[PDB]
């Protein structure tokens, strides 16, 4: 550990933007659409769409862990604490060569294969007061989730029920104990944000996460169900996360696509409610892959040599 006190701001961390831009370029030479459409305006309202048609090679895009080592004239500083807001003065900081192996998983609503919370479930937010700022949840115990191009994902109803609890409890432990915690599905928006979207085998899965976010701080949902089955769908025409615009990928082909990932975290986003009675409603969120990266770099910060 480094014997000094420094400031950290994962919400304004620059490595996030440095990885994000990398992960995008890690996408332009691995997953290339058959056609990519992107807004093109002079400002005069009228906006032509810039079209691009390239080969559409079916590649089973399988993410490789990524390290981030400071070159020279530069040093990475890691923060150490069982519960770090990731936005303030860190006491147990410590210089490191490369950040832990991170598997740049691009997804929405659920953070897959990320890094678990050592102690307990932690939830960071650039401002919990602002019903506009994504709440990044960090699970201390991942929940396996298996998706298949066959059309769905299975999740443990047990583990997910617990998780919502040990999350619902960490929420009120920030918005007011004497406050009811509820979970509802997406409010609306793009398919990629409304469902738990992500990529598996180069196939863009779109799983309906209603059964994962319709939890009332009162009842249950395990009648005749041992596992939660999200009705997933693979799309060819998708909205790009790298930049405003659609993109069409070629249909599936491999006799079988399969994924078994660790739900290591979520991206929630409680609704304003305009100071109404203690009844905070949290819904799935994300779509801004940087929050993802953040959830992984929340405790890092590269700095110039002295």
């Amino acid at each position: 550990l480094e014997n000094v006190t420094e400031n950290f701001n994962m919400w304004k961390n620059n490595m996030v933007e440095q990885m994000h831009e990398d992960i995008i370029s890690l996408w332009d030479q691995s997953l290339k659409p058959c056609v990519k459409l992107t807004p093109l305006c002079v400002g005069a309202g009228s906006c032509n769409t810039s079209v691009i048609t390239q080969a559409c090679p079916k590649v089973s895009f399988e993410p490789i862990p990524i390290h981030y080592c400071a070159p020279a004239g530069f040093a990475i500083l890691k923060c150490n604490d069982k519960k770090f807001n990731g936005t303030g003065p860190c006491t147990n900081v410590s210089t490191v060569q490369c950040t832990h192996g991170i598997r740049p998983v691009v997804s929405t609503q659920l953070l897959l294969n990320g890094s678990l919370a050592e102690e307990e479930i932690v939830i960071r937010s650039e401002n919990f007061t602002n019903n506009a700022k994504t709440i990044i949840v960090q699970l201390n115990e991942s929940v396996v989730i298996n998706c298949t191009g066959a059309g769905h994902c299975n999740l443990s109803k047990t583990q997910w029920e617990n998780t919502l609890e040990q999350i619902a409890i960490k929420l009120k432990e920030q918005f007011g104990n004497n406050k009811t915690i509820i979970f509802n599905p997406s409010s609306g928006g793009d398919p990629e944000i409304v469902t738990h979207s992500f990529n598996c085998g180069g196939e863009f899965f779109y799983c309906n996460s209603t059964q994962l976010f319709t939890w009332n701080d009162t009842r249950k949902l395990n009648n005749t169900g041992r596992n939660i089955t999200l009705p997933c769908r693979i799309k060819q025409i998708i909205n790009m996360w790298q930049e405003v615009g659609k993109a069409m990928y070629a249909p599936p082909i491999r006799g079988q696509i399969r994924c078994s990932s660790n739900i290591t975290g979520l991206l929630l986003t409680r609704d304003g409610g305009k100071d109404t009675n203690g009844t905070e409603i949290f819904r799935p969120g994300g779509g801004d892959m940087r929050d993802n990266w953040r959830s992984e770099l929340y405790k890092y910060k590269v700095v110039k040599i002295e």
Partner: antibody
Amino acid sequence: EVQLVESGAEVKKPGSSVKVSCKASGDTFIRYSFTWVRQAPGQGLEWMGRIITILDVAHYAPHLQGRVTITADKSTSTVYLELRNLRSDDTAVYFCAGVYEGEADEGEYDNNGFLKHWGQGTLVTVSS
Amino acid sequence: DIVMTQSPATLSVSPGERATLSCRASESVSSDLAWYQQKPGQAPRLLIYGASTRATGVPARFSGSGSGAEFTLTISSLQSEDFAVYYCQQYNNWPPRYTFGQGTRLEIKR
């Protein structure tokens, strides 16, 4: 199960431009990708291009790029094929052809090259 | 740039008999190959697609065979109505640059 209807046969003169219509009915328009296939008398099919309707993108035949365009009016449910700078050889029966693509209005898209549904065909005579 | 050549420019055969057509392709077109049938003065007719799969509502006598650059639309007991020119369509490259065969007339030999 769609039924494609085309505009009337037109007699255009050299160096001009022609626009053939193609009414698509009987199913979900945006779920189809339409292709124009021309055929000169005595000659055989020649791929003119295809419009991935829903996306409003269309790719064309090498020997036509520049002088041809394919557009679709989702409102009226029509597809159009425009050839400009008409030559005599362009004289042919221009066919309108389409294929189902899948729940394209839902992100699903097979992007099929073959053509399951064909038009009645529109003849265009480009001569002086 | 793909050339699709239908070797049998013309095939004279009699009803009930078995007629065979062969479409030759430049480079490999995998299985993105369809077959069409055209009666004089009619829009083509999608017979086979994906090389070996008949289009909805088509006589089982039409056999779609092949893969790569060698396809074959073989027909068992040819029928009176089976007289027409046959066309193979290549639609495997992308960007889209589909090409048609030059044809084959399935004329009745008498």
